[PDB]
Write a structure and sequence with these properties.
By secondary structure, the chain is α+β, with helices and mostly antiparallel strands. The protein has 4 domains: 1-155, no CATH class; 245-351, no CATH class; 352-460 and 497-512, no CATH class; 461-496 and 513-758, no CATH class. It is 58% helix and 6% strand. It contains 33 helices and 10 strands. It binds phosphothiophosphoric acid-adenylate ester and magnesium ion. It is classed as transferase. Keywords: Kinase, alpha solenoid, pikk, nucleus, tranferase, dimer, DNA damage signaling, transferase.
């Protein structure tokens, strides 16, 4: 605000003082520059939601119009549009709409400086008239949207056309999923059904048949209207994706809309016509959903889907070829189709030194994962990977085939240039081993640029596709958080990692760089700082013995245990960051990331939040949540249910200081939850894309349910949708959540492996 106000003063004074200016700078030039600087400041003030400053600016701009018309400037349209924006942002919807319509009626948008295209004005009026319900959705399309598409004049590239096409596509989509129109279609369908049943009962007949035919004609009209809307929706989504990059979650919405209509040949003809102009970098992150619908059926849907998956794997190989490999090496048809795509991939010129590399490398990674020997691999040791035959074959094969580390997160390149990606140079000679049955081994790889990429080569009978899908969903929602001022100002978001499933029994997990598990810090620290307290194992055993007793005894035992167990988390920051400046910044990072993941894991039902799934990053302070596969409330179905919204035990809360909760954690919870329920449409779109994934399981299979404690899509998405309801205020919702997350009667009846005493 300070810089922008001083800039306003500067530009106005320079425009007034004619003798200070140079020779060839007339007063029209100074005036025009002043106006442009003011309009820029108005954009900036609008995002900050500073109402009074946009009001001041638009008033001071409207006062310049008389003195601008005498200098020979035509800046009335841009300034009146700024006034209309101020009105709309103060709540005057009808006044803003009337002002924009007056701009459109009597103004020459062609011959005037500070240009203003007629199609963006028309689409602005159309958007505002739709929001205010000021006209029927059949006149909005006839007066504002189709005239806008006609004003583009065949230009199908740029941000102007991107805005127009996204406007029109969202309008048509909104017309399809309309509760009134769906009720009307259902009513006409029941009428047709009942009248046909009555006619069958009879075979009076003449009039009955005539009424039946009139019903049929009405139903044909309604269905044809819906078919036109579907055509326009799909076509304009595809044209908006091909024009600009402003709207790129239109790829997720187009994909959901197209997978719902895989049989309606109308949709497939429109897609066939327009699909080849979208850059494949828009679909690159949707390969879990695309490669799950592959089949060999010779239809048109499959001939489009297979070609799209092929082009994605050719342009961005490190984003599609592992999906193809996993798919090759209704399940039989999917495997056959993925095998055909793989055979075609190992035939073309662009990707031919890349597909064999990934082939051989994945084979040896899987072989190394599956190889368990209790003698050759002792849990906790550190074995040089040259003594097993699998180890030597692995090292040789990896030396002969250079690839980027499979757990490195590669960003998608618009220029299609993946040469700047570090390849695996060599492997560290040894590999660690963790405790389990099928020994998870932690490899290290030294890359070309000289960094160390550690990896968990996880083998056994686990399902990493759940964890990978949920990591992708959480990353998408955290990306939604960046669009709002309050959460973006605080960098509220989650830390991601990379899961890569190789087969149905093995995967590569990214070993997060310099973290430490929460339980592995907390259990030694508890006895280092309080040598007279109970041990972690004594508390766990004491709580597990009273697991088959009444709630009164369980709560009494829990109080007795936590009276002899004091939190020590506040020391994690006093012993990794002794400098007060750094200590304060890192403790704030911890609090903010804990708040963001608490709200985000309440909204998505995230469970299984024990100490071994939470990592503490001792370089930046901020927590990382891994193992995100038990989501959508699957955790309160277990034998000993997890009935808390998130993990907020005494140690998580002790890491926050004098102000236990009231402070940074509560304000950040409220900003997160306030930004989440203003993106409920986008979260619905993400979960809808999840709904068309044939391989995602919406219930926890008794295998993992036994590994954890020693329509389902419709119910889950409905629960998510009612957690984002604006009925209660954010303050009251967060108060309730923090009351039930820290309650002793809730924490006392949790499973003993969920270390709640801690
Ligand atoms: N991707 C990862 N990055 C960094 N550390 C990890 C990662 N995955 C697991 N860890 C940690 O390294 C160890 C590996 O844990 P695992 O033995 O694979 O599974 P686990 O969670 O320990 O077993 P349970 O069922 O939870 S008792 C644990 O101490 C984890 O905290
Ligand atoms: Mg784990």
């Amino acid at each position: 605000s300070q810089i922008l106000s001083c800039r306003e003063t500067t530009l106005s004074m320079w425009s007034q003082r004619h003798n200070l200016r140079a020779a060839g700078l007339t007063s029209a030039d100074a005036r025009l520059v002043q106006i442009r600087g003011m309009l820029l400041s108005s954009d900036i003030f609008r995002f900050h939601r500073a109402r009074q400053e946009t009001l001041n600016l638009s008033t001071a701009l409207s006062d310049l119009i008389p003195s601008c018309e005498s200098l020979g400037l035509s800046v009335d349209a841009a300034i009146k549009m700024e006034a209309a924006n101020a009105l709309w942002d103060h709540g005057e919807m009808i006044s803003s709409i009337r002002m924009l319509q007056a701009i459109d009626k009597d103004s020459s948008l062609k011959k005037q400086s500070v240009p203003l295209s007629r199609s963006d004005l028309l689409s602005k009026i159309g958007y505002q008239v739709s929001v205010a319900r000021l006209e029927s959705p059949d006149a909005i399309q006839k007066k504002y949207l189709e005239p806008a598409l006609k004003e583009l004049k065949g230009k199908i590239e740029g941000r102007e056309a991107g805005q127009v096409f996204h406007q029109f596509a969202v309008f048509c989509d909104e017309q399809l999923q309309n509760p009134d129109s769906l009720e009307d279609l259902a009513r006409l369908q029941n009428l047709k059904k009942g009248k046909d049943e009555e006619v069958a009962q009879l075979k009076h007949l003449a009039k009955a048949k005539q009424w039946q035919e009139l019903d049929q004609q009405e139903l044909r009209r309604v269905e044809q209207t819906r078919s036109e809307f579907l055509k326009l929706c799909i076509e304009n989504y595809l044209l908006s994706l091909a024009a600009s990059d402003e709207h790129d979650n239109d790829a997720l919405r187009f994909m959901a809309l197209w997978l719902e209509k895989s049989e309606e040949e109308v949709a497939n003809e429109v897609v066939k016509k327009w699909i080849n102009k979208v850059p494949t970098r828009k679909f690159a992150l949707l390969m879990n959903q695309l490669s799950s619908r592959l089949q060999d059926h010779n239809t048109l849907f499959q001939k489009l889907l297979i070609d799209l998956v092929y082009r994605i794997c050719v342009d961005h190989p490190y984003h599609g070829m592992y999906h193809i490999w996993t798919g090759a090496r209704v399940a039989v048809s999917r495997q056959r189709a993925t095998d055909k795509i793989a055979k075609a991939l190992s035939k073309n010129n662009k990707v031919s030194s890349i597909w064999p590399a990934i082939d051989q490398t994945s084979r040896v990674y899987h072989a190394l994962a599956m190889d368990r020997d209790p003698t050759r691999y002792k849990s906790g040791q550190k074995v040089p990977i040259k003594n097993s035959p699998v180890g030597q074959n692995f090292l040789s094969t990896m030396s002969n085939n250079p690839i980027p580390p499979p757990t490195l997160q590669i960003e998608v390149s618009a220029n299609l240039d993946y040469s700047h990606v570090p390849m695996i140079h060599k492997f560290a000679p040894e590999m660690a081993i963790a405790s389990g049955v099928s020994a998870p081994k932690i490899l290290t790889a030294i890359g070309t640029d000289g960094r160390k990429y550690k990896q968990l080569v996880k083998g056994g009978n686990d399902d990493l596709r759940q964890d990978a899908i949920m990591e992708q969903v959480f990353a998408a929602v955290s990306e939604l958080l960046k669009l709002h001022r309050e959460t973006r100002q605080r960098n509220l978001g989650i830390r991601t990692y990379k899961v890569l499933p190789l087969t149905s029994s093995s995967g590569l997990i990214e070993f997060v760089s310099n973290t430490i598990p929460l339980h592995e810090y907390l259990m030694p620290a508890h006895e280092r700082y309080y040598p007279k307290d109970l041990k972690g194992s004594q508390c766990r055993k004491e709580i597990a013995n009273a697991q088959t007793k009444n709630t009164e005894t369980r709560i009494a035992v829990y109080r007795r245990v936590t009276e002899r167990f004091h939190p020590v988390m506040r020391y994690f920051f006093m012993e990794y960051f002794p400098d007060p400046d750094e200590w304060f910044q890192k403790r704030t990072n911890y609090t903010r990331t804990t708040a963001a993941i608490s709200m985000l894991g309440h909204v998505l039902g995230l469970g299984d939040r024990h100490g071994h799934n939470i990592l503490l990053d001792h370089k930046t302070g901020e927590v990382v949540h891994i193992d995100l596969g038990v989501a959508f409330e699957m955790g309160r179905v277990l034998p000993v249910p997890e009935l808390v919204p998130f993990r907020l035990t005494r140690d998580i809360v002790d890491g926050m200081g004098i102000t236990k909760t009231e402070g940074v954690f509560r304000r950040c919870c409220e900003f997160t939850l306030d930004a989440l329920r203003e993106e409920a449409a986008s979260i619905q779109t993400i979960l809808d894309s999840l709904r068309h994934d044939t391989l995602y399981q919406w219930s926890i299979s008794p295998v993992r349910m036994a590994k954890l404690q020693n329509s389902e899509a419709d119910r889950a998405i409905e629960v998510v949708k009612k957690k984002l309801s604006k009925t209660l205020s954010v303050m009251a919702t967060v108060n309730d959540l923090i009351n039930q997350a820290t309650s002793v009667s809730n924490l006392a009846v949790l499973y003993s492996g969920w270390a709640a005493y801690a």
